[PDB]
């Protein structure tokens, strides 16, 4: 029952087009409320709320740490990006695609990164209507999954194809299911 | 495109903290403050990079210091409990006798404290379980994953039991084949 008090700190590096445009943010929070932050595009600490006022003024008076934060985009952001690039930015895990009835379901699992494209085809033609997706689901272990269902109006001998496009592949991945 | 976040937090009166690196929503690693070592989310990450775990403690000590100060400035205003929404799903499509993983996803909640228990046919399961630490969200609440490897069977039923001060009573998310 004892009331809780939480302090959170988030040092973020945002990358646009590789490392050409980098934005650094030094954020502080009391519970879930951000009270002070340093922004690369500003060059100083600004109080987000009155509780941060004393900090923004005191920290900005210290020319030693402002120098440090103003160089963060290079010494911290770009440096770390280079160190982790091979296993984060360039991580490629191909997906596993499964097609099963009961309405047709196309399950795409264990892929990374999240950018993917799943399409349903009926006799060589792409299906637009009767297609529902669950969206991108994170498993928490650096893999994603997604299910794309197709409302099916049965027929004799027609073939259904689930086509998947993903960065880890050379060409689209396919799975054909015939009744 | 991409975001790399070094996330930290200290909690009173539990006197516990966390220090982790996040890449586009996934944990690269977190620091075990008692063993003073770097715990990579995936083993292989350790073969490509390194991190001086002890450095994390310096940041955590400073975090507690700021907390002490903010606790007073705010006139001892405590945190407001936000109950988590729980989802239970599987790692891949289910097929009898084929290894799979049950995922209990706990989302949108604070403070970062939860009791998660897996139940098979109403009874506690602790063997083979693993979990992630608290992951940060953009709204500054938290996420957390708990796993249970299992062999799909028609005679077993599972429940993910979550306890959180934002809930009047334990929440139970059920799953069955």
């Amino acid at each position: 029952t004892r009331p809780r008090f939480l302090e959170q700190v988030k040092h973020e590096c945002h990358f646009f087009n590789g490392t050409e445009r980098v934005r650094f943010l030094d954020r502080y929070f009391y519970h879930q409320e951000e009270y002070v932050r340093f922004d690369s595009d500003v060059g100083e600490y600004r109080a987000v709320t009155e509780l941060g006022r004393p900090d923004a003024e005191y920290w900005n008076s210290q020319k030693d740490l402002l120098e440090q934060k103003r160089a963060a985009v290079d010494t911290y952001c770009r440096h770390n990006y280079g160190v982790g690039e091979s296993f984060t930015v360039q991580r490629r895990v191909y997906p596993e695609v499964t097609v099963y009835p009961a309405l047709l379901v196309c399950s795409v699992n264990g892929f990374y990164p999240g950018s993917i494209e799943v399409r349903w085809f009926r006799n060589g033609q792409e299906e637009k209507t009767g297609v529902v997706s669950t969206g991108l689901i994170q498993n928490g272990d650096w893999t994603f999954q997604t299910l794309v269902m197709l409302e099916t109006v049965p027929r004799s001998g027609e073939v259904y194809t689930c086509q998947v496009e993903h960065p880890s592949l050379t060409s689209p991945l396919t799975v054909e299911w015939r009744a | 495109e991409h975001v790399i976040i070094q996330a930290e937090f200290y909690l009173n009166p539990d006197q516990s903290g966390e220090f982790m690196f996040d890449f586009d929503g996934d944990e690269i690693f977190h620091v075990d403050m008692a063993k003073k070592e770097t715990v990579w989310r995936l083993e292989e990450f350790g073969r490509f990079a390194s991190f001086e775990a002890q450095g994390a403690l310096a940041n955590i000590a400073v975090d507690k210091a700021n907390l002490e100060i903010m606790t007073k400035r705010s006139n001892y205003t405590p945190i407001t409990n936000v109950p988590p929404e729980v989802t239970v799903l599987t790692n891949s499509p289910v097929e009898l006798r084929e290894p799979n993983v049950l995922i209990c996803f706990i989302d949108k909640f604070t403070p970062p404290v939860v009791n998660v228990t897996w139940l098979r046919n109403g009874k506690p399961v602790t063997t083979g379980v693993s979990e992630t630490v608290f992951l940060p969200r953009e709204d500054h609440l938290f996420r957390k994953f708990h796993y249970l490897p299992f062999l799909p069977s028609t005679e077993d039923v599972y429940d993910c039991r979550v306890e959180h001060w934002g809930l009047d009573e334990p929440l139970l998310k059920h799953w069955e084949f």
């Binding site: 040092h11 502080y28 740490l65 982790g84 | 450095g55 400073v62 700021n66």
Partner: peptide, 7 residues
């Protein structure tokens, strides 16, 4: 990797 210091 380099750490950024909390202040």
């Amino acid at each position: 990797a380099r750490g950024m210091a909390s202040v």
